[PDB]
């Protein structure tokens, strides 16, 4: 009983959600600019900043809500579309349906909107992680730097255009557009003094990766004078060009999604960056490298052996997981966990368009929520005890017990109890790897799920237990409602997304 109404519902919702967000951003920006002369906080009760804050929060939430309904529409649409071509067995008829255009708004950037499952998963992750991160940045924004309240709406708009285009050039441009806001946030909002050099490291590594990706994109564009993913079906690349392109895109996207030899920038940036932006960087930003690579991996025929890339990813996993024991800073430990699971996800895209991509797609969201939760816990500890080092804080239980309980439950979920999506993603990827490489699968499993887990658990257990004897005059209070609800929502999302529709994945 699928008809045209659902098709047009899905398309209209996809386009109109973007225009909703854009009009919110434009109105709030106009109000901010034209209300005062200098555009800085007035430090009184009637500051425009207040309104702006609410506006931004409002919009994201509302857009997310619309997105959810929008997302559901797509699912049904996609499902039935497949059916409409699976059951067309008569040789005389063919599915020839041509749609119209909405008469209210123009197509942004003169392009036709096309969407896929992994793009909408990325958009949902952007929505949720941006909401959490902007909630975790209230205290950092103050006199003379309130403008960066607008950063996450800009991120949402850019990622929307990124995921809703079949233009490979606009794809690359939207991928490139994400650097300036990130650098500005690290430069102007971070409180630590060491963050000035960390931003430079972030910029230089990420831009080297972007330069490699740019070389590959220029290669593809010049050889095939086209900007559509479809036209690549009618042009063949020789062995040399295919090898050059695959190496360039792998290295360039592995600079951002940190492969083994390039994670120094990520470690420094997480150690020095503000907590909210750290949540955004681990939860969502690195995933932008997985998406683009996937697209460029799937549109080209490559006739090379993926053993070198698989070995690089596995070396990343082993190197990151072996370094967890000797970490006393909790934020660095969370960064290393992020590195190991990012490399695990990046491994799943080393077999092309095979069924290995489903585990990677699910584990991207799994890591997004796990990293958001871990960095939020680190932020709570840092704001409570004014430190994030095991040698300075322990016995988080017995004083503010809710934080300790959250730490222990986070450890359980990271260990991967069979009731959540971490176990599902591990099962997918490890089944495929065991069939593809048994000894490699065993080695990777032992290194990741035992040694790294033991180091992680030692560093986190020692902080939770003990006696907080040092400074009783300055000991803090327990969690607030905001932090409790954020942690509970992360747990709930993991457990309940273990129940998503099986048509996908």
Ligand X SMILES: CCCCCCCCCCCCCCCCCC(=O)OC[C@H](COP(=O)([O-])OCC(O)COP(=O)([O-])OC[C@@H](COC(=O)CCCCCCCCCCCCCCCCC)OC(=O)CCCCCCCCCCCCCCCCC)OC(=O)CCCCCCCCCCCCCCCCC
Ligand Y SMILES: CCCCCCCCCCCCCCCCCC(=O)OC[C@H](COP(=O)([O-])OCC[N+](C)(C)C)OC(=O)CCCCCCCCCCCCCCCCC
Residue 37's binding partner among ligand X, ligand 3PE, ligand Y, none (Cβ under 5 to 8 angstroms by kind) is ligand Y
Distances (CA, A) of 114 to 164, 262, 414: 5, 33, 35
Chain positions 98 to 157 lying near ligand 3PE, rule: CB under 6 A, are 104-106
Asked whether position 85 contacts ligand Y by CB under 6 A, the answer is: no
Q: Which of 2, 27, 33, 36 binds ligand Y (CB under 6 A)?
A: 36
Considering only residues 26, 204, 412, 417, which one is a binding residue for another protein as defined by CB under 8 A?
204
CB under 8 Å to 57, separation ≥6 — which residues?
131, 134, 135
Q: Please identify, using beta-carbon distances, which residue of 50 and 218 lies nearer to ligand Y.
A: 50
Residue nearer to ligand X on the CB measure, 118 or 493: 493
Residue from 2, 23, 33, 264 touching ligand X (CB under 6 A): that is 33
| DSSP bridge partners of 329 | 389
Q: Does 445 bind ligand X (CB under 6 A)?
A: no
Residues from 47 through 106 that contact ligand X (CB under 6 A): none
Q: How far is the CB of 110 from another protein (least distance, A)?
A: 5
Q: Look at residue 243 and give the partner it binds from ligand 3PE, ligand Y, ligand X, none, a contact being a CB closer than 5 to 8 Å depending on partner kind.
A: ligand 3PE
Q: Does 138 bind another protein (CB under 8 A)?
A: no
> Applying CB under 6 A, does 38 fall inside the site for ligand Y?
no
Tell me, what DSSP letter sits at residue 386?
A: S
Q: Does 409 bind ligand X (CB under 6 A)?
A: yes
Q: How far apart are CA 247 and CA 255, in angstroms?
A: 12
What is the spatial distance between Cα 350 and Cα 356, in angstroms, rounded to a whole number?
8
* Beta-bridge partner residues of 167: 228
**Pick 39 or 354: Cβ nearer ligand X:** 39
Structure tokens at 11: 């398309």
Does position 240 bind ligand 3PE by CB under 6 A? yes
Give the separation between CA 173 and CA 98, rounded to whole angstroms: 29
DSSP secondary structure of 18-60: HHHHHHHHHHHHHHHHHH-SS-S---STT-HHHHHHHHHHHHH
Q: Is residue 488 a contact point for ligand X (CB under 6 A)?
A: yes
d(CA 92, CA 117): 31
Site for ligand 3PE in 1-60 (CB under 6 A): 16, 19-20, 23-24, 27, 55
Q: For ligand X, which stretch binds (CB under 6 A), given 305-313, 333-341, 348-356, 484-492? A: 484-492
β strands within 12-165, DSSP E: none
HEC assignment per residue over 299-336: CCCCCCCCHHHHHHHHHHHHHHHHCCCCCCEHHHHHHH
Residues 149-178 that bind ligand X (CB under 6 A): 154, 157
In three-state secondary structure terms, 387 is: coil
492: contact with ligand X by CB under 6 A: yes
Segment near ligand 3PE (CB under 6 A); pick from 244-252, 295-303, 331-339, 487-495: 244-252
Can you give the binding site for ligand Y, defined by CB under 6 A?
Answer: 34, 36-37
């Amino acid at each position: 009983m699928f008809n045209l109404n659902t098709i047009y519902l899905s398309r209209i919702f996809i386009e109109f959600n973007f225009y909703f967000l854009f009009f919110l951003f434009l109105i709030s920006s106009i109000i901010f600019y034209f209300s005062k002369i200098i555009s800085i906080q007035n430090l009184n009760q009637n500051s425009v900043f207040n309104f702006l804050k609410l506006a931004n929060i409002f919009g994201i939430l509302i857009s997310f809500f619309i997105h959810i309904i929008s997302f559901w529409f797509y699912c049904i649409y996609s499902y039935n579309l497949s059916l409409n071509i699976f059951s067309d067995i008569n040789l005389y008829n063919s599915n020839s349906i041509e749609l119209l255009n909405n008469s209210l708004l123009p197509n942004y950037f003169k392009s036709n909107i096309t969407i896929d499952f992994f793009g909408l998963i990325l958009l949902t992750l952007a929505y949720i992680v941006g909401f959490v991160s902007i909630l975790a940045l209230d205290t950092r924004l103050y006199w003379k730097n309130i403008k960066y309240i607008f950063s996450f709406t800009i991120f949402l708009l850019i990622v929307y255009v990124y995921v809703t285009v079949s233009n490979i050039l606009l794809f690359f441009m939207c991928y490139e557009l994400l650097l300036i806001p990130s650098f500005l946030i690290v430069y102007f909002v971070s409180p630590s003094r060491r963050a000035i050099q960390a931003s430079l490291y972030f910029v230089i590594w990420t831009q080297l990766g972007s330069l490699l990706v740019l070389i590959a994109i220029s290669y593809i564009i010049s050889i095939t004078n086209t900007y559509e993913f479809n036209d690549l079906k009618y042009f063949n690349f020789t062995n040399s060009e295919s090898t050059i392109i695959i190496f360039l895109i792998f290295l360039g996207f592995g600079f951002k999604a940190p492969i083994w030899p390039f994670h120094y920038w990520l470690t420094k940036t997480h150690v020095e960056a503000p907590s909210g932006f750290s949540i955004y960087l681990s939860g969502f930003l690195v995933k932008t490298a997985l998406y683009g690579f996937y697209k460029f991996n799937t549109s080209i025929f490559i006739d090379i052996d993926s053993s070198i890339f698989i070995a690089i990813c596995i070396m990343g996993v082993v190197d990151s997981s072996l370094k967890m024991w000797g970490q006393t800073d909790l934020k660095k430990l969370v960064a290393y966990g992020t590195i190991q699971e990012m490399n695990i996800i990046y491994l799943a895209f080393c077999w092309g368009d095979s069924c290995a991509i489903l585990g990677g797609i699910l584990f991207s969201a799994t890591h997004a929520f796990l990293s958001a939760l871990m960095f939020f816990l680190v932020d709570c500890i840092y704001r409570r005890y004014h430190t994030r080092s095991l040698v300075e804080v322990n016995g988080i239980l017995h004083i503010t017990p809710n934080l300790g309980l959250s730490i222990l439950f986070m450890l359980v979920f990271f260990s991967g109890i069979p009731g959540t999506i971490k176990f599902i993603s591990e099962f997918y990827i490890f089944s495929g790897l065991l069939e593809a490489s048994p000894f490699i699968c065993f080695i990777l499993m032992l290194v990741a799920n035992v040694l790294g887990l033991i180091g992680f658990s030692k560093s986190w257990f020692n902080a939770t237990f003990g006696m907080p004897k040092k400074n009783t005059k300055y000991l803090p209070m327990d969690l607030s409602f905001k932090e409790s609800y954020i942690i509970l929502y992360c747990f709930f999302f993991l457990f309940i997304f273990s129940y998503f529709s099986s048509i996908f994945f």
